[PDB]
């Protein structure tokens, strides 16, 4: 149908808006502690701790298949990312504060980009 294109022309809209957030995001930990998946190697007691891991590149792949249905659906996944972190990390911490940095930073543009999403749509 005409109707589900169009709906498909939205979410594609929208990933086109989440992926520039994503990259504002990306910018604001230029030491790259969110850029991939903490290590279960590395760190092999993580999944007793942290229910819901999340990261730069498991958010871009989600984004990439289109599937973030909304901006909320994209925030619920950044702040897994910070909340995780200040969970884990003490707040002494290199990565503790990393966090809070990035949900300091990150809120400027999540607040305008939630404005966007209503406007355009
Ligand atoms: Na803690």
Redesign the pocket.
């Known amino acids: 149908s005409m109707e589900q294109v169009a709906m498909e022309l939205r979410l594609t809209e929208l990933t086109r808006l989440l992926r520039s957030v994503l990259d504002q995001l990306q910018d604001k930990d230029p030491a790259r502690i969110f850029a991939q998946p903490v290590s279960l190697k590395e760190v092999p007691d993580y999944l007793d701790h942290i229910k819901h891991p999340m990261d730069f590149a498991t958010m871009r792949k989600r984004l990439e298949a289109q599937g973030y249905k909304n901006l909320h659906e994209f925030e619920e996944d950044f702040d897994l990312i910070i909340d995780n972190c200040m969970?884990?990390?003490?707040r002494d911490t290199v990565f503790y504060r990393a966090a809070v940095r990035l949900r300091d930073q990150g809120g400027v543009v999540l607040r305008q980009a939630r404005r966007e999403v209503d406007s355009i749509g």
């Not at 969970?87 to 003490?90: G, L, T």
């Open positions: 969970k884990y990390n003490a």
